[PDB]
């Protein structure tokens, strides 16, 4: 359901949080003191709001912009990545200005 990106991930430097709420996508950049092992279930320089599936994402950070590309496709078989080709299309281009060296996934 989302990702953490940054350098320290402790509050000593800013970090980027991306979360999917099913109603919305929520994106926030802050001096977060993130959990030692983050989880989901039922200050701050920037904020923004807007097996059978394979969901693909590309992330890169260039000149302070954080760029995201994505694609969704069905799959016929469940063992690992399906051999073939389709191109990811640009999702968003966030003007955040933060440095990134590590990331983590929100299960």
């Amino acid at each position: 359901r989302g990702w953490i990106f940054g350098t320290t991930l402790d509050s000593k430097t800013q970090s980027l949080l991306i979360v999917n709420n099913a109603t919305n996508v929520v994106i926030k950049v802050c001096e977060f003191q993130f959990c030692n092992d983050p989880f989901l279930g039922v200050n701050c320089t920037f904020e923004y709001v807007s097996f059978k599936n394979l969901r693909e994402f590309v992330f890169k950070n260039i000149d302070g912009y954080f760029k995201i590309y994505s694609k969704h496709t069905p799959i016929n078989l469940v063992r690992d990545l399906p051999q073939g080709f389709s191109a990811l299309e640009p999702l968003v281009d966030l003007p955040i200005g933060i440095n990134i060296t590590r990331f983590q996934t929100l299960l």
């Binding site: 430097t13 000149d63 200005g97």
Partner: protein, 49 residues
């Protein structure tokens, strides 16, 4: 004194990189252990206009 600038950093910024951090700059052989001292500095000056 409301206006400040960073005098020291570990490395130069990338284009449009923004860095808030006030962790103590080590300028030499002194192990700073999170506090100021000889060759250990709070990295922001003020203009004092």
């Amino acid at each position: 004194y409301n206006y400040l600038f960073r005098l020291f950093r570990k490395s130069n910024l990338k284009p449009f990189e923004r860095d808030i951090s006030t962790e103590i700059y080590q300028a030499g052989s002194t192990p700073c252990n999170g506090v100021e001292g000889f060759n250990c500095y709070f990295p922001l000056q003020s203009y004092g206009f």
